[PDB]
Design a protein around this ligand. Structure first.
Ligand code: HEM
Length: 214
């Protein structure tokens, strides 16, 4: 259209469906994910968000990213660390897995963070705006399914405590994106990188899936 925000939303409409329909994402929606599989995604989110957030601290002051810099509001690193300690034990840093589908995603994140920063925004957008436009169902089914004891831990990642209204924030973010300066080329690329994002995720589920069935 004419809004960076409306462009992406639409551009990734199809791939998003591809993401939803993943064999591992659908088994989840239908609430049939074992503690093992759930323990895999948490370990995936951790590696992705550390890379993501790390590259964000690199371009925090950069004009290409500064406008969407919201550390308190969004940063998930600490949230995932807390969760991962519950899921793997005080030794999670030592035990947790690091698969090749995780490695690609992390690798892409850094290439972008250093040679194509103007694109970092597409990933931030996908991760943060994604898990903010829909983190309720991910929690709703997470809760019921796993039915872990009354431990009160392991799912912090799903609660952005520093945002009262998701509605208003998602609105501030789109405003800030739409305010990002970028040449027609860069724009088409950023949109293209948002697709890249989804493919890294979709490719991730599939790899976590084959991993379960062993
Ligand atoms: C159970 C699986 C999923 C379901 C059913 C789901 C559902 C949705 C829904 C209904 C919205 C609100 C869209 C709107 O009305 O504007 C949304 C937005 C979005 N989702 Fe998901 N989603 C899922 C998986 C994913 C995955 C894996 C990602 C990737 C990180 C993701 C990224 C996004 C993004 C970026 C948006 C917002 C786009 C925008 O605001 O322009 N979603 N999702």
């Amino acid at each position: 259209p004419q809004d960076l925000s409306e462009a992406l939303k639409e551009a990734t409409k199809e791939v998003h469906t591809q993401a939803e329909n993943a064999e591992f994402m659908r088994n989840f929606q239908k609430g049939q994910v074992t503690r093992d599989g759930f323990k895999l995604v948490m370990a995936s989110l951790y590696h992705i968000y550390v890379a993501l957030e790390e590259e964000i601290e690199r371009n925090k002051e950069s004009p290409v990213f500064a406008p969407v810099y919201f550390p308190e509001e969004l940063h998930r690193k600490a949230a995932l660390e807390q969760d991962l300690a519950f899921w793997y034990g005080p030794r999670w840093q030592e035990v947790i897995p690091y698969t090749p589908a995780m490695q690609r995603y992390v690798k892409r994140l850094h290439e972008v963070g250093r040679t194509e920063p103007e694109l970092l925004v597409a990933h931030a957008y996908t991760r943060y705006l994604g898990a903010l436009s829909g983190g309720q169902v991910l929690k709703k089914i997470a809760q019921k399914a796993l039915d872990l004891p009354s431990s009160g831990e392991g799912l912090a990642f799903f609660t952005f405590p520093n945002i009262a209204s998701a509605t208003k924030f998602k609105q501030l973010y789109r405003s800030r994106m739409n305010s990002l300066e970028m040449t027609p080329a860069v724009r088409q690329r950023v949109i293209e990188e948002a697709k890249t994002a989804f493919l890294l995720n979709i490719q991730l589920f599939e790899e976590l899936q084959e991993l379960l069935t062993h």
